């Protein structure tokens, strides 16, 4: 349950906020994506 | 070879696909045996 940001390589759910640095629980590589939404997305079949 | 001298970190050995995403500069250092 719950996830905030992910890493460009070692896709490990992180989670932060201001000043808490912008790195990862290991890999220095300071990228990070902001994982999907909770509210489902609805599509049409055409 | 490629490097990234940023304050709050040493000098990260850089790679293409990153400089790309982070808008950086895929360049490396230049040194010269200067004489006194
Ligand atoms: Zn990481």
């Amino acid at each position: 349950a719950t996830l905030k940001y992910i890493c460009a390589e070692c896709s490990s759910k992180l989670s932060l906020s201001r000043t808490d640095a912008v790195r990862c629980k290991d890999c220095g590589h300071r990228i990070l994506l902001k994982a999907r939404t909770k509210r489902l997305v609805q599509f049409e079949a055409r | 070879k490629p490097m990234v001298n940023e304050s709050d970190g040493v000098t990260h050995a850089l790679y293409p696909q990153e400089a790309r995403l982070r808008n950086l500069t895929y360049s490396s250092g230049l040194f010269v045996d200067v004489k006194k």
Side-chain angles (χ1 to χ4, degrees):
Chain A
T2 296
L3 50 168
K4 303 247 184 175
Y5 301 1
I6 309 177
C7 170
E9 310 162 69
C10 53
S11 46
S12 61
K13 301 182 176 186
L14 203 57
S15 180
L16 287 173
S17 64
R18 299 154 289 155
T19 310
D20 282 297
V22 188
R23 270 186 178 67
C24 202
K25 305 303 182 189
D26 200 55
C27 300
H29 297 296
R30 329 159 206 59
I31 42 271
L32 309 198
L33 317 192
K34 200 246 180 189
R36 205 177 194 73
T37 319
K38 247 57 183 176
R39 8 177 172 180
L40 283 169
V41 274
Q42 184 196 310
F43 292 84
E44 349 69 288
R46 316 106 186 301
Chain B
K1 297 185 175 185
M3 301 183 277
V4 173
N5 214 61
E6 41 173 334
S7 50
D8 284 302
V10 200
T11 303
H12 173 26
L14 186 54
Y15 276 84
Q17 206 59 59
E18 172 150 302
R20 282 209 264 276
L21 296 184
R22 304 184 55 193
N23 292 166
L24 302 176
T25 316
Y26 197 62
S27 68
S28 43
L30 287 73
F31 298 171
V32 185
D33 293 310
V34 188
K35 295 201 170 192
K36 54 211 166 195

